[PDB]
């Protein structure tokens, strides 16, 4: 017995070094990871997350974003139109305009709209006819561009680390005024300069600026009372930057050799 159970003990010895029976983990899409990261940043600042239509009216895609029927933006050549008036959305701003109007002219508004967007273009390693945006929109009563700047700083840190700085360059979009194009300090080279940032030490990640008076007013808000800031970014681009992904199409091709690299948590590192 202290013979027999003792030599059962020994017939039962194992190499504990051998492969476990895997209990496999599926992957979260890199594009979803970036969106949720950004969801989490803004939930924590009191914002809501809004979804809208992927097929949209040209009033909300365009007219309500300060693109009158003339405007070159609305070329049938560069957007996927379905009729004269209906098309695949080109950005997530229609959702934000539809949302504002519903609020009949009372703030705050503070929303973040991620989603799929669509552009009439030929596909290669840096161009996709379907890709993703996140926009947001804050409308309140003494909203300043200093306030858009602090918000962008948090976004940039969220995405690329606590040490990031930003740079704001003047620019122009019809729906905002003033407008900015936004760079993040390069997360690879401190600020020496590198391939990643085209040896400038700055990488462009966002555009933004103050919501344009006409945009507020077409939606019912009073531009003498309320200001506004908004911004867009592209997870496809962010995640190709962050990881060195070589081909935008890799997001929509679902090679498991691509997808399955994105199982694990990440941190602020050191």
């Amino acid at each position: 017995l202290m013979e027999k159970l003792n030599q059962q003990l020994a017939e039962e010895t194992i190499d504990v070094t051998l492969p476990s029976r895997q209990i496999s983990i599926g992957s979260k899409h890199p594009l979803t990871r970036t969106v949720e990261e950004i969801e989490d940043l803004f939930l924590g600042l009191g914002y809501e997350i809004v979804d809208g239509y992927e097929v949209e009216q040209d009033y909300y895609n365009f007219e309500a974003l300060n693109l009158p029927k003339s405007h070159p933006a609305r070329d049938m050549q560069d957007s996927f139109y379905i009729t004269d008036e209906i098309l695949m959305r080109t950005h997530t701003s229609p959702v934000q305009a539809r949302t504002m109007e519903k609020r009949n002219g009372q703030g705050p508004v503070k929303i973040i709209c991620p989603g799929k967007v669509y552009r009439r273009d030929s596909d290669d390693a840096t161009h996709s006819h379907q890709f993703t945006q996140i926009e947001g929109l804050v409308v309140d009563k003494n909203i300043k561009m200093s306030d858009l700047k602090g918000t962008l700083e948090l976004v940039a840190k969220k995405l690329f680390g606590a040490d990031r700085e930003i740079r704001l360059r003047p620019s122009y979009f019809p729906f905002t005024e003033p407008s900015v194009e936004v760079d993040v300090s390069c997360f690879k080279c401190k600020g020496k300069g590198c391939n990643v940032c085209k040896h400038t030490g700055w990488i462009e990640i966002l555009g933004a600026g103050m919501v344009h008076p006409n945009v507020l007013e077409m939606a019912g808000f009073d531009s003498n009372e309320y200001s506004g800031f908004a911004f867009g970014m592209g997870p496809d681009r962010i995640a190709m930057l962050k990881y060195g992904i070589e081909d935008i199409r890799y997001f929509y091709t679902n090679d498991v050799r691509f997808l399955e690299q994105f199982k694990a948590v990440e941190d602020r590192g050191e």
């Binding site: 309140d140 700047k149 050799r257």
Partner: protein, 313 residues
């Protein structure tokens, strides 16, 4: 200067219920070995109506750049099948994917379509493998159902499952999925022809109206008390039209077991012309004192409801 706006009307930022459930659900599908896919919304006009169950107009672009991307999608399965075809060609034989994405149904001319959020996925290969131990569990239909059962469990939803015939699917290995007397999707093995066209081995897909799912308000979890004494287990053995859904047995049994039927299990089947169904009944009463007299009264009313909707032993 760098500032942050101070909002004077204070609201806590949170996911909506639907948003929250969707994070949770993705988590549980990832927890079970399924990779999150994102496929192209636009398909070839030929395939736009693939796997659609209601007949319904498709939505074509005035000016496609590609014949591959001409028409919106009434199902997620064409591109998930493509994606599995592609992996398999590259010697990635174990493919497990899910997607939550919109499909598009015309409300006719000049009208925005219905954009309906689906949950689908596709599975082929091994589910569990450890070669050195001789472990290999190949994906089959019931694994695929297990995935869909696990979605129903996490969401606290009651799904039922009746045999079916669909489009791209093996006609004796396909089922329709119902929630609250509404059909909301299916599971099935691909037709052996469609498999073969895509150089695929045994493959399973599922497709579900996530919008329907998300309409069920499930409330707070219903806790039942823990029993201080044992329940009673009896295993019955039946004989049926070899030909009858187990679901139909489970249903009368459970219709007759009142207060005190806790659970049932079909744990064995045999099949010329009739099948044997072994089913284990678990009686329990966490509330009141369970008695042998109530359990025999109910048992025998069970076996009588069974006899009369057409059942031997």
């Amino acid at each position: 200067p760098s500032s942050l706006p101070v909002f004077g009307e204070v609201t806590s930022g949170e996911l909506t219920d639907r948003q929250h459930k969707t994070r949770t659900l993705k988590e549980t599908l990832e927890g079970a070995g399924l990779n999150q896919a994102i496929t192209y919304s636009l398909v070839s006009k030929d395939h736009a109506k693939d796997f659609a169950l209601q007949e319904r107009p498709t939505i074509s672009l005035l000016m496609p750049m590609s014949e591959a991307h001409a028409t919106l999608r009434q199902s997620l399965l064409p591109h998930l099948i493509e994606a599995t075809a592609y992996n398999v060609a590259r010697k990635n034989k174990d493919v497990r994917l899910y997607e939550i994405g919109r499909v598009f149904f015309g409300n006719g001319e000049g009208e925005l379509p219905d954009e309906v959020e689906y949950l689908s996925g596709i599975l082929t290969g091994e589910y569990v493998v450890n070669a050195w131990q001789g472990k290999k569990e190949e994906i089959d239909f019931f694994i695929a159902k297990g995935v869909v059962d696990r979605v129903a469990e996490k969401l606290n939803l009651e799904f039922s499952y009746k045999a079916g015939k669909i489009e791209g699917l093996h006609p004796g290995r396909t089922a329709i999925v119902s929630l609250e007397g509404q059909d909301i999707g299916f599971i099935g093995e691909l037709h052996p022809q469609v498999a073969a066209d895509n150089d695929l081995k045994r493959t399973y897909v599922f497709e579900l109206n996530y919008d329907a799912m998300m309409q069920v308000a499930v409330g707070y979890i219903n806790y039942e008390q823990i029993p201080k004494f044992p329940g009673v287990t009896r295993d019955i053995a039946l004989e049926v039209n070899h030909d009858v859904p187990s679901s139909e047995l489970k249903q009368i049994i459970h219709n007759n077991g009142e207060d005190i039927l806790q659970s049932t299990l079909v744990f064995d089947v045999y099949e010329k012309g009739k099948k044997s169904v072994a089913i284990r009944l678990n009686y329990l009463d966490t509330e009141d004192t369970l008695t042998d007299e109530r359990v025999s009264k109910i048992h025998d009313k069970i076996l009588e409801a069974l006899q009369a909707e057409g059942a031997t032993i």
